[PDB]
Amino acid sequence: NSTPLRAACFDGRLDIVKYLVENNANISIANKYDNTCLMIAAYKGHTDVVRYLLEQRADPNAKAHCGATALHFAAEAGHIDIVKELIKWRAAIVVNGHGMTPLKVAAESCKADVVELLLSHADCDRRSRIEALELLGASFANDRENYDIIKTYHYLYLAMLERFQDGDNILEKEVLPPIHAYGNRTECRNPQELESIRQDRDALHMEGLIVRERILGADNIDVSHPIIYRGAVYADNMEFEQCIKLWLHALHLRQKGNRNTHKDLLRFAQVFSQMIHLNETVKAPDIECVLRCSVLEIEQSMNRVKNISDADVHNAMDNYECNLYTFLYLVCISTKTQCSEEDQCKINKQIYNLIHLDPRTREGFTLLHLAVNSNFPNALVTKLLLDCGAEVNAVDNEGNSALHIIVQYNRPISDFLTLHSIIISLVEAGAHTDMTNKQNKTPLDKSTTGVSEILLKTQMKMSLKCLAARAVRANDINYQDQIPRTLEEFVGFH
């Protein structure tokens, strides 16, 4: 639904814009998300393009698909000249579908001077002014790159003074209950507490986090990003426990927000990989249990999402393989980290909950199939998967089984103990040695490494069932309606 006028406004060429406008350019027509040329130019800060389109009787109070306006995006991108021009052209204060005003938008985006101008705007109330200043301070407290402790304290103190500016009525903050994930600190209500905590930089980060959670909690806003940055800094500080709790709260909010978190889970597993590598781990398996349960819920929900709309889940399908890889890494960590009886019980509970529903992938790989092949070739991961109810006889899209892939393992001499342990574990609990895959084949025939050949050959137990199945399959004799129904599958196996 894009128009060449919109592209010209995106580029910023004034001459092209004026030439097209004088040649019957359509402005009221917007894109698929209903975005006007004025509003995209305002988001891009082209003062000349915006002031000419306003002169051309183009609607400044346009409402996007989410209710946001040009003033909203100009405030978000910190274009003071644009918001000033729009106010000159009487841009009305509009609350978007996200429940936020351009004043509040500039407050969240740390555009302090835009906030100043919008407060200078006449149509502002005391409550909106206070909330804008509080949100500005809170965002400055936890900003990734525009961080400033001095600005944070100044704006929060000014907001709190405005709360206490009137003797007859004092506005008291509707503070949220303290969060253990945040650290159980409670947002301040009086100027004295803020003056006490301004000395502690971490305490003011805490206060900003609480203010952001309170202000943006009701609205449908992704508030995890400041939590992401805060936890990243804490991990850089070796304070993993508070970092872990912060990312746990971020994942919970994302689950509330129904947003994809494959990257978040990948990072929250990569941090475990690194902190295992440094050997400073002292990892707590009970915490990993919460991660496993959360990723199980997320993967089940997104699998349902893929089932609902297959046409739009190709990226979601890729995130599905990514999530399964992250779970493989979590099992690797669980092998790395010793667990208590209850902790290991909960880990196995979550793993079994995953296994009970069969998580088919592209090419039909199951958990154990992923665990055995090169993604490497983890051993205790496969053993735990088998112990947790995975199927050794599970069939891939190509038709292979668990043993097929593992015997087809390159570099056998290295990690020979892993290969031997995997073979011994899998042949126990129901691995059929001669499962033909695709065209008639033998897992012994498929294997190309002599040592693995000797291993399974020693592990072979012969039976009339296998030998006679091979003979009947080779002779192509009709077997249906003359064989027990259970053995009908067995005949197809060979």
């Binding site: 998300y33 995209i40 996007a64 978000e76 996200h98 806003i221 850089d236 947003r259 990257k263 990226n315």
Partner: peptide, 23 residues
């Protein structure tokens, strides 16, 4: 050290809060 979440937005919709997946 750390890599921030990408958060590169959809060009069609300019509303930063709106999260539109890109193919």
């Amino acid at each position: 050290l750390f890599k921030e979440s990408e958060e590169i937005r959809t060009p069609n919709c300019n509303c930063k809060y709106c999260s539109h997946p890109l193919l």
